[PDB]
Structure formats: structure tokens, C-alpha cells
Design a protein around this ligand. Structure first.
Ligand code: CA
Ligand code: CA
Ligand code: CA
Ligand code: CA
Lengths: 225, 197, 225, 197
């Protein structure tokens, strides 16, 4: 693109990811702030729709964050962002879909449509979204009108302060009744993948999450459940 | 308007001093803080902590070997400290000789506090609690709920006070001191006494 | 004491301990600095000498520090201090002894004497040392000539950078041959207690450790051994 | 004086691209970096890394689905990442499409580097390694030592490069690219070639 309205589709997009060292700061008053990025999930697309879901809580979001936040009893999301990066060619067939849900009791979407309604929805070709790189690496952002990434509206969730929960104990409590969950986690991410070309899954891309968290009220790592 | 604000100070728990580290815990809620408040708070459905402060006050000889520890946990699901070490990590960790703290007294009678550095006492960080308003829960009904699953409690109680009483000189109990609680509370949405659970 | 040379021994000493929130700071370049205090050990004295030893490495020093440093592959001690606080009366009989060793292969001291020779040695009545409080709470320090506390001379150890090790794996490696340890931990603390009055242990005091550590090269908490 | 300083760039490992996340690892030491250096470094007992840099360079079509990941571990005792996620945490995590990185080329021929933002390449943080000088160890003897206990290795090798090659389009291998290493090294305390272990 030189003029206006003209667009050139590459044979394939490429984004070189480099995650910078974590950012931690113990701000007097109690809170310890952490802002970091981590590869949150691996993606694959098929000709039939597939709905994947991931809880947006510490233990689940980040693999590093898991071990970190463990030393604190509570936490408050300050900014959670799931960005998508395509690791395939434009010759690949397929689209992605993401959005959030807030009451785990609600059934998980089953149509690209139902999902179009969720909060912070996003769709786009499996081979696009490279634009969002500047988010993950943390550089100066250019044109993001083409990027595939959504953010959690921390502005309005159940509480500001949630308890650090462990996948294990969590599930155990959800086993009793799902509902016990709402006071354990803010919301969850919904991810759909359809419009693919083969019955056997194909390498689509990957989703990195870049968050900023507040951690409070310390505890021995192993005393936390 | 509408609310009702009581600010009081009563004995929250008597302390026995031994040599084998016995570790207890009390919920930081009306039905548990103390007998008097338990009696009043009932007449109101929900309530919000404004300023909660547990203070240890001796009542023994100076020749009484022993130390006491206090702290807070908030994810009721977490395992109550097994070692005092684990305890020294919690928010508001504090610990002194079971015969000192004489100075903390100025928290109970509400007099003018001089130097309170020697006082064995900790406070509750109200600004960082799950909910602003909690439901008045009876120990009974609470246990019944935590019986099914502990997590069903995180929304009934703000925090838990972990107390450790180690180091002593005898194998049996020796009266040491009391932990009074000096709280300021907002009681709301009134209700018949016996209808609260 | 008003004049000079005159000293008054109390019936019992008292120090009200209050540990302040941790201090963490991610200083660009890689290192994440943490300075915190934790109750490191419980003390007891008998009429016969007793030698206790504790490795001065992350996993062992602090119970909170254990869960924290887990998220980083290496660390460098910057200042480690073991302070003693008496929780008993001056009418109690007994003395404490501390010092450091650096080659785990060396036998553990067995005489209050051998121990007098170790680096950063310290002795004193079980009921004294309250002076050291200002270290743990972190207030303005007064007369510390009476305090019972020693520091690790970080200035001269094997490496500046040691690997985060776990009690488990550590022991396993020491099981092979103790020597494998020197490249796993800087030194260790030696603690003796004799000159007591009863055959059955008596409540002496407790030892809090106040350290400042540098943590580097991140890793998933659970991938660390 | 006394030392000897070689600075070179050779292929460190060929890469196959598949769909089932295969995760490998290479020690960041002379005997393993590459064939050429392995041959030289032997003539010197110990050595110290000055600047180690692994750089991925493609050699496939643009129609080649796939991504590659690199990172570093230092406590040889730690468990090699099981999931690429776990990998994205390590120091110097980097990852791009298995056909990009064409730009990294300026690290291998030592030319003037223009913009290297698109280059799939990471470096070794030499300032933060256990020892300054390491012993030249042969894969053989090393394995034999780690056989008894892994920890006996922390003092033989500075770090380990964790590499993940996931996302592909076929069940079998497809030649993708190579990882060359561009290192600057100080070789010392010379020795007969065959006497080094
Ligand atoms: Ca928890
Ligand atoms: Ca009620
Ligand atoms: Ca380790
Ligand atoms: Ca050799």
C-alpha cells in the first residue's frame, strides 16, 4: 500500500517474537506489581468448528505467573491481553474467534455466531494478526487495525480482588457445583476455530498473553491452595 | 443514614502458654470476634469491617518463658500454617514475649496512645478485602458450608487470624494473656435475631 | 545505665517483632532484587551441648523465599543475617553459639571451642540479644554491642552466582558424595546450645533471618530442581 | 598475552520442521557448539565464553507452516521444558516463522547489520555465568558424569540452549533451516588433543 484502498496480501506473514525480562515492583502499601508476557496456548484449525476455553486466572494464564503469584494470597487483574500470531502461510484456509464469558455456568458457545456476540470479540484469517507483535515484544505500535488480539475489560468484574486458586482445588470445588466458581475467577476466554481445509488438524498459530497483575497479602508458597 | 456504627473492644480469646507449638485460628467475622459483638451484630443481616485490630495483653509473671505470633490468611482454602515459620510470612506478622505488650493497653480503653512500638498487636487491611459487605454467618452454618467445600467460604468471611503460641517452660498450660479485639463496624439491613445464619 | 560502667540486668528482655512487607524491584539488566525477613528457626537449650546446622541457600533460608526464588534459575546472596531473639527470662540458664562453615565435607563442630574459631562467631546468654530487634523490624539502630546476630561475608564465597537447588535433589546429589555440594551452596550456619539447666529441652528463643537476594534467568516454577 | 582468541561462525544444528512439538537441547560448550570449534578448542584445557550467539537461518519455501523457539537454562539439574509454554519463560526466549529471519544473515558473515528486529537469534548473558573459565568437556565424559549425578555438571557447562520446533503441515520431516553459532572465545592452558576429556 502506497495509495489508499489498495491492499497487498503476502504469501505468508512473519513476526519475530522476543519477550523482554519481567517487570516487578514492590509499591509500598502491600501490592507487588508484575507485568509480563507468556506463550499461553498452541493453535490448530480443522474443517469443523472447535471451541476451546481457558480460565483467565493466574494459575491458568501464565506458566511463570503460576509460580510467582503463588507467594501472595490475592491478586487483581490490571490488564490481560490475549494476542494471536500466525505461524503459517496465507495459502492456509481458516479463521479464528475469541471472546469472553463471565459466569462459568453459562454453556460454552458452539456457533461462530453466538461467539460473535461475546465481549471483546475478534475474528480473522488464521494467517493474519502479525500486526499484534508490537504488543507482545512491547515496541512502538504501528497499524493495529489488522491485528488479532483482545483485552479483558478489568473495569467491570465480580470483585477487584480474587484469591489465588490452584487448578486442582479449583476443579474440586467446581465438581461440587460449577457456581462456586464465580467467586474464584473473573471470567474466561472462549476460542473457536473453523473454516479450515482438512479433517486432521493443521498448524495455525499460537496465542501469547501479556498481562499486568497486582499481588497482595503474602503466604508460604506451599500453604496456598 | 440507614447504617449503624458500633466501635468496641472486648476479649477475643484467652491464651494458654506451652512448649509444644500449638497453632489456632479465628475467623475475622462478627460471630467469632467476641461474645458481645456476636450478640449485637446478629440484629443486622450484612456488615462491613471498618477497622479491625487484635491486640495481645499479658496477665502473667515476667518469669514466664514464651512467645506469641499472629498473622492473616485470606483464601480460606489455604492450609493453616503448620510451622510458625510459614506463619512469619503472612500479612501483619507480629510476635513478642508472652509477658510484654503492657503498652498495647491504650488500644482497649481508647486512651491517648504514647509509644506503641512494644505492643503486640496487628490490624486488618480492610481496603484489600474481597467484598465490602459480608453476610453475618453463624459458626454452625459456616462449618456446614465449608463441609461441602471450603471455597464456598471465601465470600462469607474476609480473612482469618492465624495464631501461634510456642515456647514455654512446662508441659501443661499456664495462663498467659488475652487477645482483645478493637473494631469499628457498620451494621446494616436489620433482622430478627434468631433468623440469622 | 546513667553513669559509665554500670549495667542493669532485667528480670527478662522483650522485643516486639513486626516484619515489614517484602521489597522487590526488577532492575533492568535481568536481576530481580528481594530483601525480606523470616523466622528461620526455633531454639531450645539443654545441659549437654547440641550442634544444629542450616544451609544458607534460598530453599533452606526462607519459607517464603523458597516459593519466590523458584521462578529464577540462579541467585546471588547480597546480605544474609541471622539474628537471635530471646523469648525467655534472665533467670533462665544457657548460652548460644553461631558461626559459618564453607566446605560441607568438614565435620560439624562439636565443642563450643571449635565453634569459637569459625567465621562470624557469636556467643551470649540465651535471654539476651533483644538488642538485635532493630535489624529484623528494620528501624533505626541504637546500641547493638549487646546483640546476638551474625552476617555472612558474601564478599568471599565460591561463586557470586549459585543455582537454585531444592532440598530434595540437593540431598540426592550429596548422597552420591557430599563434595558435589560446594558448587551448590555458598556456606552453612552452625549453631550450638549448651550451659542449660535441664536434661529436657527448654524454650530459649528463635532465630529470624533478614536477607537481600539477587535473582536471575527466569524459569517455570515447576521446571526447577 | 597467554590466551588465544578465536571468533567464528559455523552451523550449530540443522532443523527439521514437523507438527508434533519436538523439543531438543544443546549444551552451550565448545564440544557441542559445532564441529569446527570442537576441533580447535580441544588443544586448550579451559576456555571462557566472551560472546555466544545462536542464530536461526531459513532454507525453505514461504509456504512452509511452522514456528521455532529458543531459550536458556542454567541449572543443568532443571527439567528440560515439556511444553513450549514453559519454554517461553526462559531467558532470551525468541520465536518466529520457520521461513523468516532471512535478515539474521548479517550475524554469520560479520557484515554491517542493518535492521535486525526480524532476526530469529538470541545471545548468552556471559556476565551472569557461574564460573568465568570452564573445562573443555567431551560429550562422552560429560554424560558419564551426569550419569552419577546431574549436579556434577553445573561446574562443567555454563548453560543449555532449549530449542522447540512445533507447528508443521506434515507428519514427517521437512528441511527448514539451520542454527549457526557466532561466538568469540578465549582458549587457554593448551594440551595434547587426545588428552582432553
Ligand atoms: Ca490460595
Ligand atoms: Ca446471615
Ligand atoms: Ca534449579
Ligand atoms: Ca578437559
Amino acid at each position: 500500500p502506497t495509495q489508499a484502498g489498495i491492499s497487498m496480501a503476502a504469501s505468508a506473514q512473519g513476526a519475530m517474537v522476543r519477550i523482554r525480562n519481567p517487570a516487578v515492583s514492590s509499591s509500598r502499601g502491600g501490592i507487588t506489581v508484575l507485568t509480563h508476557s507468556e506463550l499461553s496456548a498452541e493453535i490448530g484449525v480443522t474443517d469443523s468448528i472447535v471451541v476451546s476455553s481457558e480460565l483467565v486466572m493466574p494459575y491458568t494464564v501464565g506458566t511463570w505467573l503460576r509460580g510467582v503469584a503463588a507467594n501472595w494470597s490475592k491478586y487483581s487483574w490490571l490488564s490481560v491481553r490475549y494476542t494471536y500470531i500466525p505461524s503459517c502461510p496465507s495459502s492456509t484456509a481458516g479463521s479464528i474467534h475469541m471472546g469472553f464469558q463471565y459466569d462459568m455456568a453459562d454453556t460454552v458457545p458452539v456457533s461462530v455466531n453466538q461467539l460473535s456476540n461475546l465481549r471483546g470479540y475478534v475474528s480473522g484469517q488464521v494467517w493474519s494478526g502479525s500486526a499484534g507483535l508490537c504488543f507482545i515484544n512491547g515496541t512502538r505500535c504501528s497499524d493495529t487495525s489488522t491485528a488479532i488480539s483482545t483485552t479483558l475489560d478489568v473495569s467491570k468484574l465480580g470483585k477487584k480482588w480474587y484469591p489465588y486458586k490452584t487448578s486442582a482445588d479449583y476443579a474440586t470445588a467446581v465438581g461440587v457445583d460449577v457456581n462456586i466458581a464465580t467467586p474464584l475467577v473473573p471470567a474466561r476466554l472462549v476460542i473457536a476455530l473453523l473454516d479450515g481445509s482438512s479433517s486432521t488438524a493443521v498448524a495455525a498459530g499460537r496465542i501469547y498473553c501479556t498481562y499486568t497483575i497486582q499481588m497482595i497479602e503474602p503466604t508460604a508458597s506451599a500453604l496456598n491452595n
